[PDB]
Every structure is written in structure tokens, then in C-alpha cells.
Write a protein that binds this ligand. Sequence first.
Ligand SMILES: Cc1noc2c1[C@@H](O)[C@@]13CNC[C@@H]1C[C@@H]2N3C
Ligand SMILES: [Cl-]
Ligand SMILES: [Cl-]
Ligand SMILES: [Cl-]
Ligand SMILES: [Cl-]
Ligand SMILES: [Cl-]
Ligand SMILES: [Mg+2]
Length: 348
Amino acid sequence: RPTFYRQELNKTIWEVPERYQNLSPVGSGAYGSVCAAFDTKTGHRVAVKKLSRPFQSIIHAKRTYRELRLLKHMKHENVIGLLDVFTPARSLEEFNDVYLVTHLMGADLNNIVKCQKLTDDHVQFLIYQILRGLKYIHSADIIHRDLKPSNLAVNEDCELKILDFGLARHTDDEMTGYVATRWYRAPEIMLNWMHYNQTVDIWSVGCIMAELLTGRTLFPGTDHIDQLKLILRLVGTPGAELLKKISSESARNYIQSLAQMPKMNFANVFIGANPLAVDLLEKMLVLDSDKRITAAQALAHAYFAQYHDPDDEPVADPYDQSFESRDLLIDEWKSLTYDEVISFVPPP
Ligand SMILES: Cc1noc2c1[C@@H](O)[C@@]13CNC[C@@H]1C[C@@H]2N3C
Ligand SMILES: [Cl-]
Ligand SMILES: [Cl-]
Ligand SMILES: [Cl-]
Ligand SMILES: [Cl-]
Ligand SMILES: [Cl-]
Ligand SMILES: [Mg+2]
């Protein structure tokens, strides 16, 4: 067991191993508080996240277990990994606090799209890396569910990492009105049309790629219905085949109220873009999720000829998510979480 030291940082007691020095507050969601620190064992600048009220309800206890299982599994160059996890508790009986340690991220894709001029070459390399990371995530039957520019961190070398997996339901309030939290979501999840699957992440990659090419949000809706009208004007209204797959009867009735519209010419929307970029956008931004290109298929598209190497695009170890359908008490979720904290082995 390492030695721990205590300090108060913005009304919060932090108790951390001595290896972690120069703690400085960076942020706080409602899931926890984050400090930047210097890790003296590795020489990395790190983010240390202290979870807030990790075991306060069955829903919160299970979310804590879900987040730790997911971060422990992810071992890929284009995905955030877990550097460390610790608790100052010396037994299960006194276990209350969980701390997670990752690489400290500088810029996100939002910073570079807003404030920098991107060549077609830059767009090929950035989208290539998102798809390499998604081939790995999807091979484990994991869905990210929240891909957007603020969840895609990049370093000076142009090396991209996916972070901030969707691990809890968003609040109705967070998805309401003129907000980036909804602009990247597939229409089947935004309007609860049907059981969704990993195809929702490829819709989000199409939206991000379009914004790198134009410098503008593709579907900046003022609310759910405005955003659906923006989407159907580009891709066309649904045919009989997709309407049959909308399990929601009222959602089907509303769609049929709208005047029919054909798919637009994407060469006339993305004026001057590489024709191979236009072709790949037409294969991602398909309204029927069964017909979208997959991450593995997209990696072999001619747009990525400069970067594609089928011997250096790895898949994940199998991932057991049977816990997701299990009904347990708070103390059972807390015991499962304690076992995952004490069994952690750091990367090489
Ligand atoms: C950080 C950062 N800020 O500006 C840049 C970066 C790098 O990620 C990048 C690599 N390729 C796209 C980016 C544009 C520019 N640089 C050439
Ligand atoms: Cl230490
Ligand atoms: Cl990492
Ligand atoms: Cl504790
Ligand atoms: Cl964003
Ligand atoms: Cl597993
Ligand atoms: Mg985020």
C-alpha cells in the first residue's frame, strides 16, 4: 500500500498517494471533481477524478461499477485508457471513495475546428483515427453513444483519443433546445424510434467529418423537431421499408404527416470537397441504420488509402456485460467495485 496525503481543494478533501504532486482543480460535473497533477512514477501529466457520492443509490452504485469495468477494459492507441484507480480505504468495511487516473488531455477537436485551418490531408488522418478506435470499441460490442468534438482529444503530433463514453442516460434538460449535446445524435435515438445498436456511432462520425470539411455544424437544430427537418431535407424522407422498422406507432404517424422530399446531391452541399470524402459521407449519413457503412468497412474505403493498414487495426478482447441485466443491492455493487479496484494492474 502506498502512503497517502490529504488536502482541501475547493471545499473537497482529496486523499491521494504521494506519487501524485501539484494537484490543481480543472473542473466538476455532477458525477465528480477533476484535478490536474504530475505523476512522479511515470513522468505523465494526469487527470485525477474523485467520484461524487459513488454508492448513494442502486442506480449510482451500478453506474460506478459500469465506468470502472469499461475503463479497465479499453487498451487501444485511439481510446482513453486507465493509468490508475485507488481508494484510501484499507478494507471493504471502510470503502466510500473512488479515484480514477488518466492522461491529461490538452486540446479537443472543438478547439482545432473553431480556431485552425484543416487541409483534406488533416481530415483523412483525424477521421481515420476515430474509425480505427471505433472498430476496436465495436468488436467488444460496446456502443459509445456520445461521440462529438468535445469528446475527441488530440496532441501536438495530431494523435487522436476517444473519451467520455456514454455511461448514464442524459437529462431531458441537457438534450433540450439549441445544444451541441443533441446535434451529433442519430435520429433513431434522438426520437426513440426503435432499439438502437452500434450504427448510432457511425451517424455521429458523419456529422463530425462534415463539420471538419465546412467548419460549420451539419444539423444545428433549435429543438428535436427543427433538427429532424434539417436531417430529412439532406437525406430525404423515409420510404415504406424504414417506416415498418419504427416500433413507435405515434413516431410513425408524425413522420407520415411530413411532405415527401428526395435525398439532396452531396457534391452540391459539400462544394469543392474531395469526391472520395463526398462518397464516404453518403455511406455514413443513411437514415436506415441497417444500411450504414460499418467502422471495419469504412477503414477499407479509398479516402483512407494513405493510412489504411489491415495488419495494424486491432480488435478488442471479449467483454462480458452480463452484469447489465443483473438486479443487486447497493452493498453488492459496492463489493464488486472494491474487487475491481484491488485487482487493477497498471499498463507496462
Ligand atoms: C493542438 C493543435 N492546435 O492546432 C493544431 C493542432 C494539431 O492537432 C494539428 C495536427 N493536425 C490538425 C491540427 C491543426 C494544428 N496541427 C497541425
Ligand atoms: Cl506513492
Ligand atoms: Cl490512454
Ligand atoms: Cl474511502
Ligand atoms: Cl461538442
Ligand atoms: Cl470481460
Ligand atoms: Mg465530455
